[PDB]
């Protein structure tokens, strides 16, 4: 159980590091692009729809990372409480187990 | 069973104000939409899709044509 939990933590962390790395890159990109938008004369509602679209593309990146964090927690919880007579309907989960 | 008559009225694409507009004097017509938790016309088609076709994950192409093909067609 020790070495397994240890390998699961690193795995779950590697996913976390990536989400952070990816989320800061998309934020800087939006900072660069809202910079060109102020450089040229740009309608105010146009500058906000760039942020709105940019903000939404970030929520996607985080949600996807959250999905994998939950899928990983489901794997680990299932395996630790695993007992005979339990029923596993996922089969993509089951394959990972 | 377990199907509110309001969830489908939105499945056609009619917005709620139309319900409040068409329902009018009907009190349970408003209370059924007031109690119903379905938000959006496409989300109601999904609550209708899993009850009608359980076991099949839907598609926006299949979610819309399901109601159209069932009766109007």
């Amino acid at each position: 159980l020790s070495t397994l939990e240890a390998e699961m933590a690193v795995e779950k962390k590697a996913v976390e590091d990536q989400r952070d790395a990816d989320l800061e890159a998309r934020a800087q990109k939006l900072e660069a692009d809202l910079a060109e938008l102020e450089a040229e004369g740009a309608k105010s509602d146009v500058r906000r729809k760039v942020r709105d679209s940019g903000e939404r593309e970030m929520r996607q990146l985080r949600d996807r990372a959250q999905r994998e964090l939950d899928r990983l927690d489901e794997i680990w919880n299932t395996f630790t409480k695993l007992a005979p007579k339990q029923l596993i309907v996922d089969e993509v989960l089951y394959r990972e187990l | 069973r377990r199907q509110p008559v309001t969830v489908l009225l939105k499945a056609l694409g009619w917005t709620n104000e139309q319900i409040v507009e068409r329902f009018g004097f009907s009190e349970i017509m408003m209370g059924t939409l007031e109690k119903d938790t379905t938000s959006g016309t496409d989300e109601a088609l999904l609550d209708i899709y899993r009850k009608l076709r359980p076991g099949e994950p839907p598609t926006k192409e299949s979610a819309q044509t399901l109601l159209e093909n069932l009766f109007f067609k």
């Binding site: - | 496409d42 076991g55 598609t59 926006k60």
Partner: protein
Amino acid sequence: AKKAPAKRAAKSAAAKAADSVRAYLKQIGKVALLNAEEEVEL
């Protein structure tokens, strides 16, 4: 439809749920069709 595409994830709720042929079609649908190059590869 950004919050609607997350509701279209109810397709996940369907993959977790009477007819025997429907059951078999669900599983064969989970695989992916090869193109000409992969068929040669395999």
